[PDB]
Symmetry: D3
Subunit: 112 residues, 6 copies
């Protein structure tokens, strides 16, 4: 029942090393991430729903885990998540349905 | 100045043949598409913004063209499009920046 | 030795929730799936071999597991599977060779 | 009306240069291709139908062009092609529908 | 004979708009790009060869065009490019061979 | 602490079966791999750095494991690896950052 907690913590352990050893790269990346996700015409929660759809489409368990955790923090509802996953399935077929299952599992895990 | 009009019309010519020759497949696909894009907790425009992000991430000129055209129909603003493209670049890097350029070109074309 | 049984069962647990909570989406998707896989000019086994190649190309363990299980049910032979995996390697190189290994493991697991 | 003839000829012009300048790489690649596509439990036409599905899933106009041309040579029917494209749409959603349209265009072009 | 000059110029026209309208996003992205490509344990030419391999693997004509142009600027040789494309084919199969052809075309175009 | 040793060993077990049962395919694939990775204008270590970038971009844990192991054998430095991973992040965004973390974990595992 802690699959995605373990995935995200293991990635974070390595990213801490990147922040130390490639600080210019990680600073640049953070600047891109902050600029992309800031509140604007689309609010942060809406932008994170887009990130989740992309994470599913890219079949990336790590991104699914991190963006799930953020969606819980931003008080996204289960229904908002399900509707975003539906769009991923429309644009990805069978494989995206498989990762949509992973996204629901992650969201439920972090909603604990 | 009609790049995406030509791309979408050429695809539509083939899809008309699919509707005739594989009607069960195309009916099933349409049912999935309608269920995915219907108004709910996320409105149709928001769902189409997600579709556009996915189209950019999938590097699909056809989808970029169709979803651009729909965004114009749903009265999405330029700023809403730019913010969705920003999320694609965050989740895709250089390649997604290239297709974000295509998406802006398509949106401007259909806004004529 | 039950890797893919676990993977598929865990996905199925989530899909059961999708069937309850997004029935229109799942009905649409099922309609598309049934239309795509039905006997026609190509038989069901041949279509599942194509699905398995696509699963390997998409590097999707879930799809690999489900389609493996279906290939066993449809009495695909080991040699038919190997020849399909060969085509995936030709069209995908090193990475596809890695997922072809997973597909053989899954097929052997469900053939038990 | 010669879109894919032009795409395949332009690629072939470059591949002739690779055959001259990287003969060991091209010989290796040819050996893989021949081993993958040879008649066995699956006949060559069936293997090419698999290649066409993969080409659509990979959104590769070049691959779509070449494999279309080969399918015509191997006397694949329009209906066998359509059914293969249906499997790609099932495993790829909207983006694969867009490239399925390209595949039908290519098949019709080389059927002239 | 000016295919990639056109592709890159058309993308650059849109990116100029992004620089004006999303300056924080483009500044962040530029910071990431500069940090990634700067001389270090690997020199700039070596890093651009890696970028070209990734562009081919990502089947991105735009990236192929830009990175080709930069490789010429950095005085990469034809043989260094060919060897990089060989690695892409090994890791990508048929589809990568198709985009390796595009990369050679782009390199020859910007070497004029 | 043996995640990638386990992944690579499990794949190798299946590949041994492919070598026995599909020797023509595996011989062809080996010929391509040897031609691609041989010393030339780029040395073997440089070519493996390219393979590692591609493995990250393709989000392939198997490929990441094998190419990590080879990089250790070819005496690649940690800094050369980091810089290669930086290029992958530049060309892939968030998802590539997640697999770069996996690559660093693999490299550290095989450096033991």
């Amino acid at each position: 029942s802690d699959k995605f907690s373990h995935i995200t913590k293991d990635i974070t352990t390595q990213l801490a090393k990147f922040r130390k050893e490639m600080p210019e790269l990680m600073t640049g990346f953070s600047s891109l991430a902050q600029a992309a996700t800031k509140d604007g015409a689309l609010d942060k929660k809406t932008k994170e729903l887009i990130a989740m759809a992309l994470a599913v489409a890219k079949q990336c368990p790590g991104c699914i885990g991190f963006h799930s955790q953020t969606l819980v923090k931003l008080q996204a509802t289960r229904e908002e998540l399900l509707e975003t996953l539906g769009m991923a399935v429309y644009m990805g077929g069978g494989p995206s349905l498989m990762y949509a299952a992973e996204a629901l599992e992650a969201f439920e895990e972090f909603s604990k």
